[PDB]
Each structure stands twice: as C-alpha cells, then as structure tokens.
C-alpha cells in the first residue's frame, strides 16, 4: 500500500491549486464577478486617464467594468468596450410587463397609434415582441459621460438616464457621449 500515500499526495496538491483558483474568482483580477454580463460600446473624444477595469455606475450603484480602450485613426475617436452586470440593469417578469404596456400606451399613443397601418392588431404585438429579446434599461437619449470621482479621485463612466421612450439591446452603441473635463483649457477660458 505504498502508492496510497502517493495518491493522497497527489489528491491534496491538485486540490490546493483548485481552491487557489477559486479565490481567483472573487479577487477580481482574472474572471468577472458578473452574472450573465453583456457587452456594449460607446465612442468618445476624450478618455483621459481612464484605465481598464474601471467603474460603471447608474446613480452610484456600480454595474459594470471596462475591458478595452481602442482608437481608430481614420476618424481619431476613442472607442470603449465594456460589459454590464445585468440582473439589475436588465428587467424581468414584472418590469417587462410594465415597460411593454408603458411605451405602447405613451409612445404609441393617439399621436402614433391612430397614425399607422390598416390593421392595428399585428403591429400592437410588434412593439411587444421587439422588446422581449433582451432589452436592457437605457432610453434613447440617455447620455454617458466621464466623471472624476469626487475631487481627486479616478475617472469612471457615469451612465445618466434622460427618461426617453425607446431602449436599446445588448450590442448597441450609446449615441450621446462626452469626454472628460480638463483644467488646462478651463483656467485659460476663465482667466
């Protein structure tokens, strides 16, 4: 029975590394602590001091990370690649029933429902079937900008809702961006 000690000596040392990678989940360096995350992108003109693995907030609740920051010199703009944690930026059975009846009554009101196709039975299901396929939370004129975290913090993407009427799926691009603020031009334009 000389191989048994040997076998447990393998059984421990492969188990110790397995728990060692189990701590590599919640540590946050490798892997993401995100339950069914989904990617979105945005295009800026000034991403000064915005590292990868940054913070993405809605009003103060951190709901994402930042994965890669890319340029494209033919248009000289920035392009940010980020994923959001969604089970709390994504709706569910209550809110999907809530939003589908919201926009079909408000956006598709008598200004819009009584200016339309002949049969108002197929298009009424079109506004609801265009929403079940992974709608998130973010309206048509919500803007994304770069904050500065207090007074001497570090930069992070701030998603601000604009109220709006139509939302966007998992894969889109936010069309209302603005770059960071900088003390270089501002003191010159103040003095």
């Amino acid at each position: 029975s000389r191989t048994s000690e040997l076998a447990v000596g393998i059984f421990v040392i492969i188990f110790g590394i397995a728990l060692f990678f189990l701590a590599m989940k919640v540590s946050g360096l490798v892997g993401t602590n995100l339950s069914d995350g989904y990617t979105m992108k945005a295009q800026f003109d000034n991403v000064n001091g915005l590292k990868p693995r940054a913070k993405v907030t809605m009003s103060g609740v951190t709901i994402g990370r930042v994965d890669s920051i890319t340029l494209d010199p033919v248009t000289r703009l920035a392009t940010v690649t980020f994923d959001l944690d969604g089970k709390l930026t994504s709706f569910n059975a209550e809110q999907l029933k809530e939003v589908q009846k919201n926009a079909l009554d408000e956006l598709r009101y008598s200004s819009d429902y009584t200016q339309a196709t002949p049969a108002q039975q197929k298009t009424m299901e079109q506004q609801l079937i265009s929403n079940m396929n992974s709608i998130t939370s973010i309206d048509e004129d919500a803007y994304i900008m770069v904050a500065t975290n207090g007074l001497l913090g570090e930069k992070y993407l701030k998603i601000v809702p604009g109220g709006g009427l139509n939302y966007l799926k998992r894969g889109d691009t936010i069309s209302n961006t603005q770059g960071t603020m900088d003390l270089e031009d501002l003191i010159s334009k103040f003095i």
Binding site: S4, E5, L6, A7, V8, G9, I10, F11, V12, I13, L19, F20, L22, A23, M24, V26, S27, G28
Partner: protein
C-alpha cells in the same frame, strides 16, 4: 538526462511523502485523547506559547514605530496627519499581523517542534516508546499539535495590540499629533467584524500549516544529525512558502 531524471524522482518522492503527512494528520485528530493529555497540553503551552511571548512584543513595538514614522512625513505635505491612525491599523490588522506573526513563530517554535522530535529520533527515544508501548502520535504529537493551533492566535492579537500602541508612542509623544484625531481616525475606518475577526481567520490557517509541518518533518526524518538541519529548513521553507502562498487566496476571498 541523468541529473534531470534524478530531480524528477526527487520531486515524485517528495510529493508522495507530503500525502503521507496527510494520512498522519487524520490519525492524530480522529481519536479522543485520554486522561493525562491536558497536563502535557498545559506544559506545551508552557513550552511553545509562554516562551514565545517575549519575542513578539519587541518586534511588535518596532514595526509600528517605523510605519507611522515615514509615511506621515510625505503625507503631512498635503492635508493629512489625521489618517495616520488608519494606515497603521489597516495594514497591521489585515496584512501583517497574519503574515509577520507566523514567520517569527515558525522561527522559534517552528523549529523547537522539530528538533525536540529530532531529539527522540537519534537516540531511539522514539523507538523505545513504541517498544515499551505507547503511541507517540497520541503521546508526544497530539499535545504538541494542539498547543500549536491554539497559541498562535493567542499571540498575533497580542502582537498587533502592542503594534498599534507602539505607533502611538512615536506620534503623540514625539511628533505631537492630536490624540482625538488619532483614535477617531481608526474608529470610523476599522470595523470589528470585517477586520479584526477576519485577521483571526487568517491566523488560524496560518497556524495549522505552520505547526503541522513542523511536527511531521521532525517525526519522519532519518536520525542523521546532518540531515536534521536539512529537515529543519523544510519546516521553514514549506511554512514560509505556504504562509505566504495562502495569504493571496485569503486576501481575495475576504475582499476584492
């Protein structure tokens, strides 16, 4: 090829052993100790802990005197001498009082568990015990192991208490820092259930891997008094590799 295969065999044998020490470890704890066990258990505390007490105060007094001495002089230049009490506390409590407490403990008592059992191997004072009939795994191992588990969290709190109270002595008695901003800097930032309690849960698994190796590597060693020192480093080497190797999983599970 030659030396390479040699080293390969070496590693294999080593891993094989390691496993063994696991098979020893269940056989010590999965039995109820008899009468007379507590009397040796007290004497092991008398041997391991009480003897180890005089060291960690001095190295406890030292590191606080240094850490509050040098960071402040760069920190005072902006606006902050009130966060002196936070940076001394939160690096001792969640970072060093687990780690640097063991490396002084693996130094003193991480050796004296091996050489006291490297004692009974060279003059066959192990073998005579079996021959008369006891089992040293019940007799000379289990009161040694149970003191080693207990006495280290009994010290690393003691360590960090003088560790913080040391840095107060440089601050208010020589740097003239405000006492109220010193302590209330800590009170707001150092919770109990997340730092001091989770500074203990680090120090338990830093005590088990440090003391179980130092028992086994003194038991299953050949009685040669040259290799009693090569077995001595493998206490210290495998402790310090694993007491540092398991800080990085324990830092990540608590926070991050």
């Amino acid at each position: 090829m030659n030396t390479i295969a040699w080293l390969g065999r070496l590693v294999i044998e080593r891993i094989r052993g390691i496993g063994v020490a696991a098979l020893m470890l269940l056989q010590i704890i999965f039995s109820l100790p008899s009468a007379g066990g507590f009397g040796r258990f007290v004497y092991q505390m008398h041997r391991v802990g009480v003897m180890s007490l005089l060291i960690i105060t001095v190295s406890g007094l030292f590191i606080g005197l240094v850490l509050g001495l040098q960071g402040y002089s760069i920190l005072v230049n902006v606006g902050s001498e009130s966060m002196l009490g936070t940076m001394v506390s939160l690096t001792l409590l969640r970072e060093l009082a687990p780690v640097v407490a063991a490396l002084l403990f693996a130094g003193r008592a991480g050796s004296a568990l091996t050489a006291e059992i490297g004692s009974m191997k060279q003059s066959e004072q192990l073998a005579s015990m079996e021959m008369i009939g006891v089992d040293p795994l019940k007799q000379i191992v289990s009161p040694r192991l149970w003191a080693g588990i207990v006495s280290l969290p009994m010290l690393t709190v003691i360590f960090a208490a003088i560790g913080i109270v040391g840095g107060k002595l440089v601050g208010v008695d020589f740097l003239g820092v405000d006492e109220g901003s010193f302590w209330s800097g800590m009170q707001n930032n150092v919770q109990f259930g997340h730092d001091v309690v989770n500074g203990i849960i680090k120090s338990i698994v830093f005590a088990l891997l440090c003391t179980w190796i130092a028992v086994f590597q003194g038991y299953a060693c050949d009685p040669t008094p040259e290799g009693i020192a090569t077995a001595m480093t493998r206490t210290v080497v495998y402790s310090s590799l694993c007491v540092l190797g398991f800080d990085f999983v324990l830092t990540a599970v608590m926070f991050g």
